[PDB]
Design a protein around this ligand. Structure first.
Ligand SMILES: Nc1nc2c(ncn2[C@@H]2O[C@H](COP(=O)(O)OP(=O)(O)OP(O)(O)=S)[C@@H](O)[C@H]2O)c(=O)[nH]1
Ligand SMILES: Nc1nc2c(ncn2[C@@H]2O[C@H](COP(=O)(O)OP(=O)(O)OP(O)(O)=S)[C@@H](O)[C@H]2O)c(=O)[nH]1
Ligand SMILES: Nc1nc2c(ncn2[C@@H]2O[C@H](COP(=O)(O)OP(=O)(O)OP(O)(O)=S)[C@@H](O)[C@H]2O)c(=O)[nH]1
Ligand SMILES: Nc1nc2c(ncn2[C@@H]2O[C@H](COP(=O)(O)OP(=O)(O)OP(O)(O)=S)[C@@H](O)[C@H]2O)c(=O)[nH]1
Ligand SMILES: [Mg+2]
Ligand SMILES: [Mg+2]
Ligand SMILES: [Mg+2]
Ligand SMILES: [Mg+2]
Lengths: 392, 390, 391, 392
């Protein structure tokens, strides 16, 4: 079921240019973003073919594209150079690797490979050869400004920039005058080829058409669809919904044995069968538990306030299902409905019951105005599975 | 092992725990006694560090930020100073790699990095520059280590963050909101090494760090509402247990942290307390439980009185000072100018005169309003106004 | 007399930090200033105690620690982190407590060198500031190697008496102090906390000497200490507006406390002339403040009550006239701005429209059948007959 | 002048320490604050004895007593120094001027004179003498700690700070430390001498008893009114009601010839005789006009929105009364009752009238849903006085 989402991402990548994997948390929309880039680019490490970037409110324009930094120059001669960020370094690296395998750009191809080594250099650049990095970049954009739009419609090395939590950072502060470049119509190779200068260093800049921005985005904090007006038109949105198909016994055995496929995977099978023998006789218990609680969430609050399938994905026994339920999702369900006991009971569909193996026992006290509030109860053993069985 | 059976079993499962609960409950105490009993350090420093969050606590002073540093006569060289978290994350990683020997060549070089991380003094520019080079050697070494030798490191470090809901929790964990997960630790199933903004260095959380948050969840509008924060942190509800306020439990608590000679004087003071309470050894338990039920049913379940208010009582006068100067201004702050509820929380809904904390003023308002006043009681008449709650 | 003095002294040993909350006009700052002066024998702030007061611009960077430019050389402005008002006290209260110890804290040359650089009023030169920053790193290497029995009992009691604690954004000003203000989370307690500061990175912990007696007003409900985690730390003393002081004898005992029998004979005949015009009753201003504070309790709240700082400084009936029409009746009108049938009831003149009423009725009416009253400045003995009807 | 509004300010400011002259606009509040201080200090301009500042919403706490203000030095342009505001430059000025006639400062009477020069110095403080200013400031608060309270009760100057429109600023934030100093027995020399510790400079500070603060708030607006109950105790509110008795025939000749003591007293008197002779020889016309509007505004609007007696004070002729009516107070009356036409017709006592000699003519065109609105009429001549005689 993972190749069906790779075909959906790859369809909306070559059509739009960049993608937002928006979904409720507990979905693998960072892992889908991380594994699709690793599968397509064939680079397991985040370096020289792709880069991982996390946004936040403290993230600024000076460290994302370029800003000013002091260096380790001479002692009484501390200098402020324009050290490039990550997005300028990844778009230059996609442009340098794109022109390295081009046929009509053979005027200085022995120098473009020199510029490629400087961009995959995994350290701060030395000041005796930073001007060699400056002169090779000035040689490059002179060459791309004197090339037609015929040979720049596509570049075969497809670079990526996995931006995680893209709605956390203020996207207008870090994309100053450069949010228009992300569209396919305004990239370096569209008909509206726009080589904008940068406000520092006087250097021109334009993103190549192979650099793809795969963003991951939570949409359960407050965002639904209208929070991101500066990126809602440039970015193609994909609903990565919580699939509870990954909680079947056949699927849970296959997922955990994908990485740990050594001899201890047999020890998982005698452990996983011990879990699905204590949940009755069925293999569809964790799937029906997630489905019959996600339906009861999307009927009350919202669709994207849904419980993901990453909480229950790491259970091996009834004790680990006890730890997931009482410490990660029911303290998450109580903060969805803060002090509203008529519907947090109904999400677990025990609305008739007031006690007797219920997660929320009713206090015997009433209210002056008529308020009645319940109380959390810790269960353990076969009583807890008897309280989980009544949800499905 | 009565409450570390939850805490120690959730750290190996998720990586970090937030002990959320109403105030007056042992959230900082459980989070401090668990870290001290495991790392064997009575004070912070080498194996753990205590911090807390506030509104003026920002991203630059937590993990990585810019900072001017003029030493004696030099110009203002703008150094990048690692915050609190990177001086724990690098310190857990370097002490982690110091015990094994698989491909970590340069054990004197790793030891040179560990000395330059526990410096009490600020780093000289002749020593900071070699510290920057050895930190780049560290991530080039970790990037060439297998996941089988990085999945286990014996010196379990601890970063305990009290009041974790105070600071801007998305602004603080900036490049850390998708790294704190157990799958994305430095040695998990998806080893993710992200690049930090200011210094440009790669940085990933080693699997030693257990971030023991203790969120206060009394007041709303500052609690963790964002569900991406509610997933990396496995919460623990620490309910205010009134079972620590019986006779045999309160005597066992305060004797545990006391000497031998004063334990007999402490036992005599607790016999004198419950002899003045009517030979009722279950009194302060049912006092806190039958006032936490009334706060749960009216206000909410997270504004309950904790068991740290009444835990430090030793006589009837010490209960009198707790009841009039620590929980009655607290009860008048919950239900401000709402008198028909605060009489019912103390179940004095029908009692308006006599042995009651709130007498009624004799005249009503011009349009049918009526207010009360906090009557100060003393002695056995106070207990007679307290034993009618239970 | 000594009851509020002893009640502060009891709660400052049990919880550690007391708060005197109450309606404005009672003895909150006064009983806090008289407590610290009578306990430390130091009438002006200095080493043993420091008075501060909070506001909205009293941020974290100048209370505990923050960056502050300071060079003391008219050149080479050194951007260094300087300790705020609190950390200059809590480090002072610690290194003053590390004098009387016998052999636990072996720093008798290095602690006294740190104390003389903490009480130094002249700002620190950089050749001695490097000594102050090095000795403070010795202090938190010293504290941590001491037993809790030789650290709980530090002798000299230091006080940071603060004022209007609710007025500042108290959860922001108290930074690392939000988890250290319990009696058992200090130094020497059962669970000591050497917590770490953000900016300087040097660790910090409050000594058991430092008590924070902080007075606040609770009539502004816009800014009241409703954080339920900063009401567990503090002990809240109720300071109600007590009208017992506004007798004839209790006003004569208070106002003739510091006069040395020179103007006391003038004050005695002046209070004899005041109460001879009120009706020869010694209990006038007691039940005047009582019948207003009760009538303002049942209407507005318990917390907007008139204090006893207004009527305490009256000498003749003219001075009561100038404290009625100019301090409390403008106060009573701004509780009830254009709410006229309520403010008429606080003076219980609700049936009285014209004559000797403070709010005479306008002879006009409204087009939609409305009406509004007009304040009437009364003088002479007719003012007292308009005031005695309140009782 | 000296009868009521002067002798009740001077008695109450000497007893409480601070006076707020609250009242509706158009009343002598700024004027009685300006006249009292100039007639007391004998200095018709600000500077040495008194300072006239005014509050606003852009006013800072950092610019009032103490704050970090970046100054412009020669070789280091961005130099952040702590600069005392206007209140700390009048409280320290009132202290070191009053400490010229004391007998315990016998070691540093030259140092107090040198500190008084640095506070009266209108030139900006150079950093070579700013440390001389800070060394003398911390010498001062060492000297008043050794001064007895019997000698700090009588400081022979009388310094004033007329703050105007006090209620406009954030008075709880501007008076940061001053919300616990501003009391008669909490200044220096009082029964409770309080020397609080300032945040920024770290130097202690205490308001001297030499100082007085005469605020003049405005109470027509309500969102800026002073409802701080802990701050209303510090001040002593004086209601200056808008008195129509300053608009009689004998009173206009006594108010306008007191100030203008030139030879135009024969010119003003024959013009004021001609103005009231056109009004029907009614010596109490403008007294009755302002009284029968302020009462009719009090009953429907608030009591603090009344027309002051500063509009009709500067009238000279019927042409000047026509200018002050249709352009100052009639657009003011259309602001109080904005499209509430049945009220504003009633305030001018034209409720039944809808045509003829009237200010607001009725439109002969009703609306769709039964609504109807009126229209102004610019009157002139004796018909205007016939529209004013209906009010009284
Ligand atoms: N094999 C496999 N693992 C999955 C799948 N979906 C989720 N997971 C696992 O669950 C974990 C959570 O997925 P992840 O992508 O990290 O959530 P997230 O997008 O970061 O969540 P958030 O940041 O928006 S709050 C991952 O570590 C991954 O291993 C899946 O479809 N197949
Ligand atoms: N022995 C023992 N003491 C406890 C227990 N719970 C609380 N206490 C005591 O109560 C005191 C206060 O508890 P504490 O942990 O500090 O509350 P808190 O969580 O920090 O409260 P807040 O910061 O959210 S407001 C501690 O000093 C501790 O000694 C307990 O379970 N056992
Ligand atoms: N002798 C004596 N004087 C008192 C008493 N209560 C109040 N006063 C006097 O009243 C005056 C004002 O009291 P004060 O403490 O300043 O009010 P406050 O609570 O501080 O006012 P606030 O704005 O901060 S809320 C003081 O000068 C004090 O002398 C008392 O009980 N005894
Ligand atoms: N001679 C004299 N002039 C007066 C008197 N009352 C008001 N005035 C005049 O009114 C004019 C302005 O009044 P003023 O005091 O400035 O209003 P204001 O307090 O500033 O009004 P506001 O906008 O702040 S709310 C002055 O020119 C003054 O001459 C008075 O009683 N006697
Ligand atoms: Mg993610
Ligand atoms: Mg805590
Ligand atoms: Mg005060
Ligand atoms: Mg004015």
């Amino acid at each position: 079921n993972i190749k069906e989402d790779y075909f959906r991402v790859d369809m909306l990548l070559n059509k739009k240019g960049q993608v937002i994997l928006y979904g409720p948390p507990g979905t693998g929309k960072t892992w889908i973003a991380r594994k699709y880039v690793v599968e397509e680019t064939n680079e397991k490490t985040p370096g020289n073919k792709w880069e991982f970037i996390t946004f936040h409110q403290s993230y600024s324009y000076e460290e994302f594209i370029e800003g000013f930094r002091p260096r380790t120059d001479n002692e009484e001669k501390i200098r402020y150079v324009v050290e490039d960020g990550i997005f300028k370094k990844i778009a230059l690296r996609a442009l340098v690797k794109g022109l390295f395998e081009l046929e009509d750009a053979t005027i200085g191809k022995d120098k473009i490979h020199r510029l490629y080594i400087l961009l995959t250099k995994k350290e701060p650049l030395s000041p005796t050869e930073y001007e060699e990095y400056l002169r090779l970049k000035r040689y490059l954009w002179e060459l791309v400004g004197g090339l037609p739009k015929d040979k720049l419609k596509n570049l075969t090395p497809k670079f990526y920039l996995i931006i995680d939590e893209i709605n956390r950072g203020n996207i207008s502060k870090i994309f100053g005058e450069l949010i228009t470049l992300l569209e396919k119509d305004k990239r370096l190779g569209g008909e509206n080829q726009l080589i904008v200068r940068l406000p520092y260093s006087g250097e021109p800049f334009a993103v190549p058409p192979n650099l793809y921005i795969i963003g991951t985005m939570n949409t359960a904090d407050r965002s639904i669809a209208l929070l991101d007006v500066a990126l809602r038109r440039r970015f193609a949105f994909i609903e990565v919904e919580p699939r509870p198909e990954f909680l079947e016994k056949e699927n849970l055995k296959k997922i955990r044995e994908k990485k740990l496929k050594t001899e201890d995977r047999k020890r998982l099978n005698e452990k996983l069968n011990e879990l699905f023998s204590k949940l009755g006789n069925d293999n569809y218990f964790l799937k029906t538990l997630l489905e019959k609680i996600n339906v009861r969430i999307t009927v009350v609050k919202d669709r994207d306030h849904r419980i993901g399938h990453s909480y229950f994905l790491n259970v091996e026994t009834v004790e680990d299902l006890h730890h997931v339920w009482y410490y990660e999702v029911l303290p998450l369900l109580m903060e969805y409905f803060y002090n509203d006991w008529e519907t947090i009971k109904w999400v677990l569909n025990e609305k008739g019951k007031e006690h007797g193996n219920v997660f929320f026992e009713k206090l015997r006290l009433t209210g002056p105005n008529g308020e009645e509030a319940y109380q959390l109860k810790v269960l353990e053993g076969d009583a807890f599975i008897g309280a989980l069985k009544r949800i499905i």
